[PDB]
Design a protein around this nucleic acid. Structure first.
Ligand SMILES: [Mg+2]
Ligand SMILES: [Mg+2]
Ligand SMILES: [Mg+2]
Ligand SMILES: [Mg+2]
Ligand SMILES: [Mg+2]
Ligand SMILES: [Mg+2]
Ligand SMILES: [Mg+2]
Lengths: 149, 51, 190, 117, 77
RNA sequence: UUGAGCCUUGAUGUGUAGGAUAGGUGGGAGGCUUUGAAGUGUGGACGCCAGUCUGCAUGGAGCCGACCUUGAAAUACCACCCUUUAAUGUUUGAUGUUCUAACGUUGACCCGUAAUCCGGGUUGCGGACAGUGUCUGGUGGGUAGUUUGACUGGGGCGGUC
RNA sequence: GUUUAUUAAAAACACAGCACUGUGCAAACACGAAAGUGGACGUAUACGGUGUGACGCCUGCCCGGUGCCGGAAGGUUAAU
């Protein structure tokens, strides 16, 4: 038969292709342990609706889990009111829920665990930098400036 | 029987084989069984080796 | 290629040594392997031949001017008949037999031109072009082709030297064209 | 194919014929030639000469694994028992150890009766 | 009784025709094979005594439909 | 993995006069090798042990042609190949190795159920075999239906149509 | 011992004994379109078939033919 697959399936499958398999394999193994299904045409278009949706649509929505950072370099500077000891060296210090909570709390809304201040993370005043995370490949840089007020 | 001869030579030197087996217990076990007739062979083989 | 690559002759002194050896079928039943009276080709080729005929003391004044050189005389039938290192090539047809001076005992001379009105008539061509290519053992074909003075220009021996497909016996499929020589070798299909 | 260089030359020398086999160490057999298989049949082969030419044929057949040196195990009585070994040495072989393995029962089977000739 | 539950296919009579055209009553049975079928719809194996033709129909139609046919002519499975 | 096709690639020829272990025609009077040769020295190797090829290499630099004979002339070189063979592949089987999930179970167990049937379940053993359907070659007095002539000094035998 | 109930009681059948041959068990083999069942609640010291016929002394030669067993490289050969 033809049959269209479900899971990845070894030396033939893919995850949602239209392979062609010996019926002995389809009945008796694949379809029963629902790893595939009869290509009843009714189905093959059940799959064409499933060829437009999740893919074409929700990847220009991860073009929004990405263009969040088109507003990461268009400000590129938050200040933290953290002072300085005996020579312009932070009396404070700012981490991730400091650089995600002092990022969210404006027009820059990020998820608190989306702010990589590799440690410096942090131990002095003035300008620093950080690695802001929204996508797996597209993060983005800013500039942070712990203001000694 | 065995000679694991060594360094600087090529000759056979196997004069050992005419010290035990070969046609010793070999021309022997080869053929007619014998039985009581060896007795007669080895009886004439002492009458000789007296003088 | 779809036909032949005659630029597939691309270090002798010329690439005339390039041979029309196309294949032909078994003897399954009764069939033979016959090359005509000098196979010409719709190419003139440019061969000023050397033709020796069994002609007379009559046509030694025109049977030598038509893509040839000399013409063996009638006293030189058995005059020049006392040599092994001393002794196309022709034989006029009909009631003219040549076993009394062309039979004994290992060369191939037979086809020429038959003419008792004209020893070189205005239109009597097809001779100064190509030769023969008869039976060898398992098949035939053996000849040559064009030159290092051709291209798809002497590839007219492909539609008129493979067009040379004749009657076959029964249980055969005789084709397999291949030329080239004195460098490399090959061809395509039929 | 393959190569070894260290081997053994087993010679089966009987009365009617003597056979010769060059095996590796693992008794895996690399090339043989026999007295009767080199010509000479009947008494012909029952000779030390036949055994010589057997050894030559044999080398030109196991020199295929470039056998530089080899033990030599000698079985049976009859000619070509030793003369065969001489041809191995000449042929061009490093001739290591020499054994005689001709099997001797501790008086076991009854041997054939006859030979009223 | 050698009958296929899918298609009705039961044995049928005809003749064996020799070379000399002698006829002899004979039968054609169908190609039966009782086969286990996983109905997903009922978390269960239903085994049918089917002809080979039987199965192919069950493929193209789907055991759910085919069984539905059985249940609709009081076929018990 | 292995038998048969099919396709490229590389092997080899001791009929007699003779420079010599000439396959058959055909191109064919120079290609070649420093893109590193002859001939020595072994390696795998075919085999009528007669001798050949070659990768490696020592090497280190010219050999040829009608040449006069031979029914047929060049290891001058190149082809489509036959003698028979040898190797990768492509194709088609077949034979073999595993798996389990079809199917077998006339092992064990659970429930229906106080049941040596049957159904379902679990497990163990097998397993794409076995078995069955359709088709097909062989076999098949086991069964079945029949044939096994007429003339004739009775029939039969012989003979005859 | 058995046998032709009703013209044959026997030298005929059987018989213990013997031999050959099949069968690893879901046995072969038998009744059965089949399920199922005999064989057997047995398991090769068993079960089937076949011939011979206590016992004593014995049982030779022939494998061309016909059966049967084994085999296979070739040749020939079906659906396909
Ligand atoms: Mg009858
Ligand atoms: Mg009558
Ligand atoms: Mg009585
Ligand atoms: Mg009575
Ligand atoms: Mg019995
Ligand atoms: Mg009797
Ligand atoms: Mg007898």
């Amino acid at each position: 038969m033809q049959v269209i697959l479900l899971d990845k399936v070894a030396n033939l499958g893919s995850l949602g292709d239209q392979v062609n398999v010996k019926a002995g394999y389809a009945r008796n193994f694949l379809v029963p342990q629902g790893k595939a299904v009869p290509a009843t045409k009714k189905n093959i278009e059940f799959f064409e609706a499933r060829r437009a949706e999740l893919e074409a649509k929700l990847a220009e929505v991860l073009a929004a889990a990405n263009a969040r950072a088109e507003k990461i370099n268009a400000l590129e500077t938050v200040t933290i009111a953290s002072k300085a000891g005996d020579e312009g060296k932070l009396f404070g210090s700012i981490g991730t829920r400091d650089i995600a909570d002092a990022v969210t709390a404006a027009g820059v809304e990020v998820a608190k665990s989306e702010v990589r201040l590799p440690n410096g993370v942090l131990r002095t005043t003035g300008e620093h930098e950080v690695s802001f995370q929204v996508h797996s490949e597209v993060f983005a840089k800013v500039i942070v400036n712990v203001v000694a007020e | 029987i065995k000679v694991r001869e060594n360094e600087p030579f090529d000759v056979a030197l196997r004069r050992f084989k005419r010290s035990c087996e070969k046609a010793g217990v070999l021309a022997e076990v080869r053929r007619r069984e014998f039985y009581e007739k060896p007795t007669t062979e080895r009886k004439r083989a002492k009458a000789s080796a007296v003088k | 290629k779809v036909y032949t690559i005659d630029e597939a002759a691309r270090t002798a002194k010329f690439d005339e040594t390039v041979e029309v050896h196309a294949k032909l079928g078994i003897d399954p039943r009764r069939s033979d392997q016959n090359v005509r009276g000098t196979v010409s080709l719709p190419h003139g080729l440019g061969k000023q031949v050397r033709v020796l005929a069994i002609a007379k003391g009559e046509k030694i004044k025109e049977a030598e001017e038509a893509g040839a050189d000399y013409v063996g005389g009638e006293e030189i039938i058995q005059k020049i008949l006392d040599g092994w290192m001393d002794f196309v090539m022709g034989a006029v047809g009909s009631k003219l037999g040549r076993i009394l001076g062309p039979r004994g005992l290992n060369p191939k001379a037979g086809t020429v031109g038959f003419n008792i009105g004209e020893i070189i008539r205005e239109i009597k061509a097809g001779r100064i072009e190509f030769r023969n290519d008869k039976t060898g053992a398992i098949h035939a074909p053996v000849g040559k082709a064009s030159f290092p003075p051709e291209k798809l220009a002497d590839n007219i021996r492909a539609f008129i030297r493979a067009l040379e497909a004749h009657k076959p016996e029964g249980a055969k499929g005789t084709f397999l064209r291949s030329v080239y020589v004195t460098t490399t070798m090959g061809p395509s299909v039929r | 194919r393959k190569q070894v260089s260290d081997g053994v030359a087993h010679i089966h020398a009987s009365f009617n014929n003597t056979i010769v086999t060059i095996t590796d160490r693992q008794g895996n057999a690399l090339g043989w030639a026999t007295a009767g298989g080199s010509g000479f049949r009947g008494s012909r082969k029952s000779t030390p000469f036949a055994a010589q030419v057997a050894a030559e044929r044999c080398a030109d057949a196991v020199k295929e694994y470039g056998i530089k040196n080899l033990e030599v195990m000698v079985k049976g009585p009859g000619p070509g028992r030793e003369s065969t070994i001489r041809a191995l040495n000449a042929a061009g072989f490093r001739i290591t150890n020499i054994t005689d393995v001709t099997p001797i029962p501790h008086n076991g089977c009854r041997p054939p009766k006859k030979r009223r000739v | 009784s050698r009958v296929c539950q899918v298609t009705g296919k039961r044995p049928v009579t005809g003749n064996n025709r020799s070379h000399a055209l002698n006829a002899t009553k004979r039968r054609f049975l169908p190609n039966l094979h009782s086969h286990r079928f996983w109905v997903e719809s009922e978390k269960r194996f239903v085994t049918l005594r089917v002809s080979a033709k039987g199965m192919r129909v069950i493929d193209k139609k789907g055991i759910d439909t085919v069984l539905a046919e059985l249940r609709a002519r009081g076929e018990k499975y």
